[PDB]
């Protein structure tokens, strides 16, 4: 104690590193050269796509999720594609959760649910999506679109 030594400080909180998954489409007129099926034509091999909910904070524990996109005209619960001459015709994209249940588009925050999290240790969302032949039939073309996920926090 002839000399004295001191450090002070705090910890700053940090959010979640969020990594996505881009899915190519390679179905290539299996569904559409065969069908010729009604506007409920969501016969399409779904893809489990993941969200890397890692790393995160600690008090980060339960949040609210949500999605925006161009609602298809026939079913607003389908994603319309990009308005392209090189595209297909008569399709709308259906989202499915990890339990394979169709997800409501553009729903307000009042209906949302607290996605409970694992503090510290990593998490990952593993969902599905498919193509629903709205018009009968579907002509060939490109399958291009964008969508948006927003998370409102804890």
């Amino acid at each position: 104690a002839d000399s004295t030594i001191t450090i002070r400080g705090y910890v700053r909180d940090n959010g979640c590193s969020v990594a996505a998954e881009s899915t190519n489409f390679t179905v290539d007129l299996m569904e559409n050269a065969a069908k010729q099926f009604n506007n409920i034509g969501a016969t399409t091999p779904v893809v489990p796509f993941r969200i890397l909910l890692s790393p995160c904070g600690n008090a980060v524990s339960a949040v609210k999720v949500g999605f925006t996109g161009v609602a298809d005209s026939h079913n607003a619960n389908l994603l319309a594609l990009e308005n392209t001459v090189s595209a297909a015709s008569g399709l709308g994209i259906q989202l499915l959760n990890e339990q394979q249940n169709q997800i409501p588009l553009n729903a307000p925050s009042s209906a949302l649910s607290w996605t409970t999290l694992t503090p510290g240790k990593p998490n990952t969302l593993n969902f599905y999506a498919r193509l629903m032949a709205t018009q009968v039939p579907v002509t060939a073309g490109h399958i291009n679109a964008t969508a948006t996920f927003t998370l409102e926090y804890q």
């Binding site: 104690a1 000399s3 004295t4 450090i7 400080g9 705090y10 910890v11 600690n58």
Partner: protein
């Protein structure tokens, strides 16, 4: 030699002056995101210590540490946050434990010396709690 005379003596070293007594550095506040892995640590930070005005013959001084370490051997935080330990070494990269000691030389001319030392912090187990941070260490000296 008509008469021969025997003259004797001894010189012993006295306390010098300090230059200071009052080291304190805050480092700002960061992320247990960035400190998530077990055994993650901070960035080092410099500290120099002088002691001046030394009596004649005084050549070497041992520095004698003191601090509150936990069972890691690294120093326990006294702030509210947890899982967090402290890291002082020399600039020869050698662990400065509580109670420990280190002798250095003294410059002949300037009657003084300095202490090139480095400090950072750490987690051991990773994923520390969030809160406040407090740390105080003491040091005495012996002379040579």
């Amino acid at each position: 030699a008509d008469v021969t005379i025997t003259v004797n003596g001894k010189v012993v070293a006295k306390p010098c002056t300090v230059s200071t007594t009052n080291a304190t550095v805050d480092l700002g506040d960061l992320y247990s995101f960035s400190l998530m892995s077990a055994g993650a640590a901070s960035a080092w930070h410099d500290v120099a210590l002088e002691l001046t005005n030394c009596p004649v013959g005084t050549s070497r001084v041992t520095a004698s540490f003191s601090g509150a370490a936990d069972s890691t051997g690294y120093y326990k935080n006294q702030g509210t946050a947890q899982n967090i330990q402290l890291e002082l070494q020399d600039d020869s990269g050698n662990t400065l434990n509580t109670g420990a000691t280190k002798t250095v030389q003294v410059d002949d001319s300037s009657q003084s010396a300095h202490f090139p030392l480095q400090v950072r912090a750490l987690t051991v187990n990773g994923g520390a709690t969030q809160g406040t941070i407090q740390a105080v260490i003491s040091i005495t000296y012996t002379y040579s």
